[PDB]
Amino acid sequence: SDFSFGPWKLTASKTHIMKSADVEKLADELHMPSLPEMMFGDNVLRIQHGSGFGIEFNATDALRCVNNPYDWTYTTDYKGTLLGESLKLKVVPTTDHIDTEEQIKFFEEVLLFEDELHDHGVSSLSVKIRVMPSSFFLLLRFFLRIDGVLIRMNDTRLYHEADKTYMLREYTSRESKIANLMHVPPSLFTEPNEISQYLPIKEAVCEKLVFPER
């Protein structure tokens, strides 16, 4: 299930969970004791150029950004994997915010991992992309609720418009202790596009991915 638009190539695969002994193997290769219950070690969302350069998302790469007594939450600040050889996107800092304020030509949502934290909450990494006639927008979201104690959300928004020679990658981290949210219905701890807006932004980074020349 793939798509192409002008200079761009979009590859995706949505598979199932890895084998049960298969991950004790990869748990060793990443050097940490446990992997999420549901490990889509084959799912990928990739966007590339006709000059090799581009960026992908997978759960193996994302999990190498979990700290290393370990992080049984699997909180990750992974922001994609750059592609290409001899021609790659360079990461420069910038002032350009992505203010999300237009018709959809293509869309898919790829799930990367999930874990239910021994039935005490949820921990999830997913990615969407909507492609449009003039641009494409993309969102890698880590979500974490621990039942009745806190919620954390790490979003990586990625955006590119046709005749700009750069994309924009915007990282935000939100977090709140749950006992600090007065009068929010419990359904909202399960709707992450709803609650996102009522949590404090702890961190925010804004880079610009300048393209190679020729």
Numbering used by the authors: 11 to 78, 107 to 139, 145 to 257
The authors write:
The broad substrate specificity and cellular functions of PP2A are controlled by formation of diverse heterotrimeric holoenzymes; each contains a common core enzyme formed by the scaffold (A) and catalytic (C or PP2Ac) subunits and a third variable regulatory subunit from four major families (B/B55/PR55, B’/B56/PR61, B”/PR72, and B”’/Striatin). TIPRL (target of rapamycin (TOR) signaling pathway regulator) is an important PP2A inhibitory protein and forms a complex with PP2Ac together with α431, excluding both scaffold and regulatory subunits. We determined the crystal structures of mouse TIPRL and its complex with the PP2A core enzyme at 2.7 and 3.8 Å, respectively. Structure-guided studies reveal that TIPRL inhibits PP2A by perturbing the phosphatase active site, and together with α4, exhibits a robust activity in disassembly of active PP2A holoenzymes in a highly sensitive methylation-responsive manner.
TIPRL possesses a unique butterfly-shaped protein fold with two extended layers of β-sheets that pack closely and in parallel at the center. Several helical wings (HWs) arch outward to give an overall butterfly-shaped structure. TIPRL structure is very similar between mouse and human 35 and is likely conserved across species due to a high level of sequence similarity.
